[PDB]
Design a protein around this ligand. Structure first.
Ligand code: 7LG
Ligand code: GTP
Ligand code: ACP
Ligand code: GDP
Ligand code: CA
Ligand code: MG
Ligand code: MG
Lengths: 437, 428, 54, 334
């Protein structure tokens, strides 16, 4: 057994974190108390779930988690909410005034004054790990803390834990629930600085999740609660192999090995199915063929893009529920004849498949319906570069006028970091096009 | 606890400031004595933004009342909410400023300013994490314009990394006949361009025209004008006072609204426009709020939005309504009127919804625009200013207090530069 | 076409299926970037206070 | 009020569409970089498909299919016909073609070429035209970009009086639902100077472009015979009709080509929608057998037909998606 530390930075990171840990506790039969009746080794263990949970002598199962935000409001809701005795107060770190949707303010101004304290509290979790494998970092691209502080943290984690893997779950900005007009700036900045320090990063466009919630859960105007509970399902499907017995993606290095052959192009596309409204009565259960065919619809992806106009260099299918290999391979055979699935010439056309027999857990009284089988496809496709093009265009429109740049220069950032960040993204867009056509 | 320190200076500033405190105290269920008597925890969650909490369970506005004459502050003390304010936060002289910016800034105001700063300091020390300051004042008089700007300058020296926010009432010949108001206003705008982060341009031209034309009040009082100011001030501070996602503090608001540091003068709007006592029995639809809040007749600055382009916009809706319908309607406005929103700032309109409405309205909407059309307001002041200044008329009132013509020329230059700067980004 | 690497346990199973074959800065440098930012920020504030003192 | 943007100013076809959309009084033209449009009449090259369909409260539509280049580039079409099982090497209506890169399937070309020498049969190929291989390979190596060696049709159908070569242009509109609409009016782009068997030097009788014919305009106005007159010629001189002898084969070729790529380019369950006007170029041999020459992604129209065709693009491609306040097309059913 090898431990994984989760780190939650900013409002988005923190609030997505809560959704994730609530869901993990339900999946493992852990209570808000922290007690886990089914666990028979009291005071410790080397079970698969112990990758995410340490244990106390009183039998309390406690997340390998630190929550960091530069303002107390949201982390206070964790301190006083349903799962409050789950966490030790040294895991919940808060500042006084936030980064004001300013990368520079999060990275330089407040990042310098808070970074040593955060590495200290991360170090206190690493010390109680027998074989720490790495970090799962949750954050937004658009917030100042989420962008600015995260990129700094990642740079430091490379110094202090050079051999350890670092995975991201990054929230890509969308105008329908965005809170700032400079989110393109912040996204480009933190991506440029974090690129060398991230081994594999899962991008979730809030636009995609918002539309999935409208279209498939029949929600008129999705809140963050609606979004986060869907995000948590996708994150759980992805982390299940670390928390449960299995032989696919069982340590963080395997995510890189299986999904990321080029280090820079480390942004696999996630696609999830089925997403079914709970308040919908009479629902025809979708077959293995139908949910597996749904993994090639843009409308089920975490980022809206078109894999047909691009190339795959890796593809994992992660099933949860009543599924056997016979029906998966039959589904793939049909799908290959009906759809456009080009791999790059230097990779084999193929699929790594993991099945856990337990179907997805739902949050009780939630928006998602219980289902007999579900799947998350993790595909490294060049079509995700569309997301970079959109973001890079919005950047260019603002930056050509130097709009809002004074806010960043005012916190000590040089104007040249903008154009360095931008031309790094130009090179990334070029790397993707070179691989893809 | 992200505290704002409020300052009100001069007749106008103290009058609109007093009305701000009446209105928000009522929305937060604070009575004239400071006691909470509300029926919702949403009123108290962010009460500390504007109120100190004293012993008992009493709430004292973090408010500093400043003037160079006693009249308006005796009126505020004698008024219904007057007992709510801390008595040591009334700082007043006896001389007056005689509607003279030089007297407020340099001579009469210089004598009182240190005792104001002591009260500001004491209020600031008591804050867990001060975010900044808001000032209410007119630019056309002496104390509010001259001393108000001096105070801004001094506060910036002591607190250079905090946000400075003003509610600045622009003079109009429809409301005042004092001949020297363009001088006072131009001098004050010179100060505001350098030393504020966010200024709400509340234009007496617009306030009067709304009262006369739309509200059909043929003899408007200052009270009728202020009724529109207090509603706007409630509206634009909602996001600071209630739990919310968008523009929750002064700095975030500034980062969303101000793409270049000098262009920080905002054009506020409000729907529905009401007069006091005349009841709105009919609640507005989300479509009507959205049409009206963007309408030229609902703007508190006398500027034609069609003569410019919006750099940034904050729209804030209040009451219980469909969020879906707000989104549709806001998206509808900017897609149907696409050419008025600069293409070089993507997604520059941000929308907030707060469940709690103002008193007497079920539905309301408050607009905050950084539009290049605000140049028309400055151009009007500039024309009035230049007409006098080219013959040096009424200038002895200012030179007699020690000022030089050079200051006037500099102020004129900086404001004319501001105007051309808006024109630059209007044609980009 | 071809299944490989089939592993089974009580919780689930996993495998691979092939259709077709083929054809970091130091602690020091971080501090110097943070400190220079702070010096530029402190220079801006001192220049402001110089202008206000005038 | 709908809104649109114009990003190819050279398009003779979509200039008339924008003019007609403005004339309706329910469409407004925005400036090219304003993203808040319902319709993009997009640029020829580097079109930003990845930026489309991410504007809330706007149904967005573009006048190109992303991936339609695979049908419309010469080297791509040969590869597409060769490798797609639905078209295949066995495809009877596309001339024997080979992709040739300068200094690839040059080795496979020479094998089939040297079989025709032993066979004692017509061995002319086009790049441009020559019967000896040595000329063609050496022509490509010193030129620049990739080229196609395609079998030249020795035995064209010829019009009388004058003994002239021709090609047929058919315009096809593929809407957002992937209905395939053949415009009823096509056009024969004719040769004027008579067809010579031996003389390959004079590239005028052999290449039937509207521009390259510049005697000229003797037999018909601007070397453009339309379908009424060509049908009449077929009835008189050959005792057949246009519909029966040629048009069924065209209908077949068009539908076969567009069905093959439908999975790759359809916008059915996508976040933006596509339509596109194509120009199929057809050659007809002496046996009245139809042959595909090329597919053009951004065709021009013939001067007489602009008014009708462009009004049809508005009716079926645009007003189908964006409805307002006697059908010129034939629906090719699949
Ligand atoms: C003595 C110098 C006052 C200058 C007053 C300007 N106004 C006028 O109507 C004046 N007209 C002008 O100045 C004209 C005439 C020449 C051409 C153009 N000018 C502007 C008349 C009062 C002149 C006879 C009104 C304001 C005036 O309105 C009246 C009396 O009709 C005033 N309103 C008030 C007022 O609002 N009083 C409040 C309390 C109050 C509020 C604000 C204050 F600053 C002071 C007191 C209490 C009343 C009951 C209320 O709430 O309505 C006091 S004086 C402007 C809105 C145009
Ligand atoms: N999915 C999701 N997105 C969120 C959530 N909270 C914020 N966001 C998005 O993240 C961006 C804003 O960043 P935040 O994480 O709120 O900002 P922050 O990291 O707290 O940084 P500062 O507040 O600037 O210090 C916008 O794109 C929001 O839509 C959340 O709970 N879920
Ligand atoms: N295999 C073949 N057999 C007979 N004629 C052929 C032929 N290939 C091409 N042609 C002749 O050459 C002409 C032009 O060919 P093609 O359309 O491939 O070139 P092109 O694409 O450069 C013209 P444009 O650029 O305007 O679309 C045709 O009109 C046809 O008459
Ligand atoms: N809207 C409004 N304007 C006012 C009020 N009182 C004064 N003014 C305007 O403010 C200007 C005079 O400034 P005032 O505040 O009275 O002078 P001060 O006491 O020296 O600050 C003129 O343009 C007046 O019309 C008021 O209560 N409301
Ligand atoms: Ca155990
Ligand atoms: Mg935050
Ligand atoms: Mg006065």
């Amino acid at each position: 057994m090898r431990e994984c530390i989760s780190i939650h930075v900013g409002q988005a990171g923190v609030q997505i974190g809560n959704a994730c840990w609530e869901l993990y506790c339900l999946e493992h039969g852990i209570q808000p108390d922290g007690q886990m009746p089914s666990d028979k080794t009291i005071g410790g263990g080397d079970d698969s779930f112990n990758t995410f949970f340490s244990e106390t002598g009183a039998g309390k199962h406690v997340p390998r988690a630190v929550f960091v935000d530069l303002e107390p409001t949201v982390i206070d809701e964790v301190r006083t909410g349903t799962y409050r005795q789950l966490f030790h107060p040294e895991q919940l770190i808060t500042g006084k005034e936030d980064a004001a949707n300013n990368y520079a303010r999060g990275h330089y101004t407040i990042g310098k004054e808070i970074i040593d304290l955060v590495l200290d509290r991360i170090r206190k979790l690493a010390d109680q790990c027998t074989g720490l494998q790495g970090f799962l970092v949750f954050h937004s691209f658009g917030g100042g803390t989420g962008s600015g502080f995260t990129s700094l943290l990642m740079e430091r984690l490379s110094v202090d834990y050079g051999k350890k893997s670092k995975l991201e779950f990054s929230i890509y900005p969308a105008p329908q629930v965005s809170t700032a007009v400079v989110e393109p700036y912040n996204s480009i900045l933190t991506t440029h600085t974090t690129l060398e320090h991230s081994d594999c990063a899962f991008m979730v466009d809030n636009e995609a999740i918002y539309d999935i919630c409208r279209r498939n859960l029949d929600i008129e105007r999705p809140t963050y609660t609606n979004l986060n509970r869907l995000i948590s399902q996708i994150v759980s499907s992805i982390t299940a192999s670390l928390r449960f017995d299995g032989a696919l993606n069982v340590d963080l290095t395997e995510f890189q090995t299986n999904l990321v052959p080029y280090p820079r192009i480390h942004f696999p596309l996630a696609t999830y199915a089925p997403v079914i409204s709970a308040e919908k009565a009479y629902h025809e259960q979708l077959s293995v063929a139908e949910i597996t065919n749904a993994c090639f619809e843009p409308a089920n992806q975490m980022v809206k893009c078109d894999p047909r106009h691009g190339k795959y260099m890796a593809c994992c299918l992660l099933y949860r529920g009543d599924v056997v290999p016979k029906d998966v391979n039959a589904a793939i055979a049909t799908i290959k004849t009906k759809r456009s699935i080009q791999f790059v010439d230097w990779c084999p056309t193929g699929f790594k498949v993991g099945i856990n027999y337990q179907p997805p857990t739902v949050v009780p009284g939630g928006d998602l319906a219980k289902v007999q089988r579900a799947v998350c496809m993790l595909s490294n496709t060049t079509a995700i570069a569309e997301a970079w093009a959109r973001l890079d265009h919005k950047f260019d429109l603002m930056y050509a006028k130097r709009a809002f740049v004074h806010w960043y220069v005012g916190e000590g950032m040089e104007e040249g970091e903008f154009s360095e960040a931008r031309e790094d993204m130009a090179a990334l867009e070029k790397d993707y096009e070179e691989v893809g056509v | 606890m992200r505290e704002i320190v409020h300052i009100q200076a001069g007749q106008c500033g103290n009058q609109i400031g007093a009305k701000f405190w009446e209105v928000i105290s009522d929305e937060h269920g604070i009575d004239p004595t400071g006691s909470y008597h509300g029926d919702s925890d949403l009123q108290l969650e962010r009460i500390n933004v504007y109120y100190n909490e004293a012993t008992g369970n009493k709430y004292v506005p973090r408010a500093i009342l400043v003037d160079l004459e006693p009249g308006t502050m005796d009126s505020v003390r004698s008024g219904p909410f007057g007992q709510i304010f801390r008595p040591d936060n009334f700082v007043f002289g006896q001389s007056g400023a005689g509607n003279n910016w030089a007297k407020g800034h340099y001579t009469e105001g210089a004598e009182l300013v240190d005792s104001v700063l002591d009260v500001v300091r004491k209020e600031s020390e008591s804050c867990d994490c001060l975010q900044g300051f808001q000032l209410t004042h007119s630019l056309g008089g002496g104390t509010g314009s001259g001393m108000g700007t001096l105070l801004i300058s001094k506060i910036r020296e002591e607190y250079p990394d905090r946000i400075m926010n003003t509610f600045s009432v622009m003079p109009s010949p429809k409301v005042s006949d004092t001949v020297v108001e363009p001088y006072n206003a131009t001098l004050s705008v010179h100060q505001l361009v350098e030393n504020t982060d966010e200024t709400y341009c509340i234009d007496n031209e617009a306030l009067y025209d709304i009262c006369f034309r739309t509200l059909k009040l043929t003899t408007p009082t200052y009270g009728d004008l202020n009724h529109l100011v207090s509603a706007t001030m409630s509206g634009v501070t909602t996001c600071l006072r209630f739990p919310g996602q968008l523009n929750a503090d002064l700095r975030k608001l500034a980062v969303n609204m101000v793409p270049f540091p000098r262009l920080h003068f905002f054009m506020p709007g409000f729907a529905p426009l009401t007069s006091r006592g005349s009841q709105q029995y009919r609640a507005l639809t989300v479509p009507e709020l959205t049409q009206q809040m963007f309408d030229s007749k609902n703007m508190m600055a006398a500027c034609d939005p069609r003569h410019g382009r919006y750099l940034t916009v904050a729209a804030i809706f209040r009451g219980r309504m469909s969020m879906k319908e707000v989104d549709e309607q806001m998206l509808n406005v900017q897609n149907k009127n696409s050419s008025y929103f600069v293409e070089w700032i993507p997604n520059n309109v941000k929308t907030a919804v707060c469940d709690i409405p103002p008193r007497g309205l079920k539905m309301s909407a408050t607009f905050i625009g950084n539009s290049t059309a605000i140049q028309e307001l400055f151009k009007r002041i500039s024309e009035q200013f230049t007409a006098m200044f080219r013959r040096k008329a009424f200038l002895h009132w200012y030179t007699g207090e020690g000022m030089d013509e050079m200051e006037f020329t500099e102020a004129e230059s900086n404001m004319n530069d501001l105007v051309s700067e808006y024109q630059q980004y209007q044609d980009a | 076409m071809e299944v490989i690497e089939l592993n089974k346990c009580t919780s689930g199973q996993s495998f691979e299926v092939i259709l077709k074959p083929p054809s970091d800065p130091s602690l020091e440098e971080i501090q110097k970037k943070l400190e220079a930012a702070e010096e530029r920020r402190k220079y801006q504030e001192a220049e402001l206070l110089k202008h206000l003192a005038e | 009020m709908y809104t649109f943007v114009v990003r190819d100013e050279n398009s003779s076809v979509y200039a008339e569409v924008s003019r007609l959309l403005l004339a309706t009084g329910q469409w407004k033209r925005l400036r090219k970089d304003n993203p808040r449009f319902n319709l993009m009449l997009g640029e020829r090259n580097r079109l930003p498909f990845g930026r489309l369909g991410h504007e809330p409260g706007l149904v967005q539509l573009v006048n190109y299919y992303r991936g339609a280049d695979k049908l419309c580039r010469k080297a791509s079409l040969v590869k597409l016909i060769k490798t797609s099982p639905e078209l295949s090497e066995s495809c009877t209506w596309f001339p024997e073609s080979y992709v040739i890169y300068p200094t690839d399937e040059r080795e496979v070309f020479l094998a089939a070429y040297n079989r025709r020498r032993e066979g004692r049969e017509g061995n002319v190929w086009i790049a441009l035209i020559s019967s000896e291989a040595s000329e063609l390979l050496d022509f490509i190596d010193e030129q620049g970009q990739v080229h196609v060696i395609q079998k030249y049709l020795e035995k064209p159908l010829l019009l009388e009086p004058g003994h002239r070569k021709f090609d047929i242009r058919s315009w096809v509109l593929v809407d957002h639902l992937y209905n395939i609409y053949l415009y009823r009016e096509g056009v024969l782009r004719t040769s004027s100077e008579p067809y010579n068997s031996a003389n390959f030097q004079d590239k005028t009788c052999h290449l039937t472009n509207h521009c390259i014919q510049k005697n000229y305009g003797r037999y018909e106005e601007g070397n453009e015979m339309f379908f009424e007159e060509f049908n009449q010629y077929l009835m008189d001189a050959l005792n057949t009709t246009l519909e029966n002898s040629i048009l069924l084969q065209i209908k077949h070729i068009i539908r076969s080509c567009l069905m093959c790529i439908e999975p790759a380019i359809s916008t059915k369950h996508l976040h933006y929608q596509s339509f596109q006007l194509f120009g199929f170029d057809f050659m007809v041999d002496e046996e009245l057998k139809v042959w595909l020459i090329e597919v053009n992604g951004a065709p021009a129209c013939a001067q007489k037909l602009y008014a009708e065709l462009c009004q049809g693009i508005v009716d079926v491609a645009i007003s189908s998606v964006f409805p307002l306040a006697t059908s010129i097309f034939i629906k090719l059913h699949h």
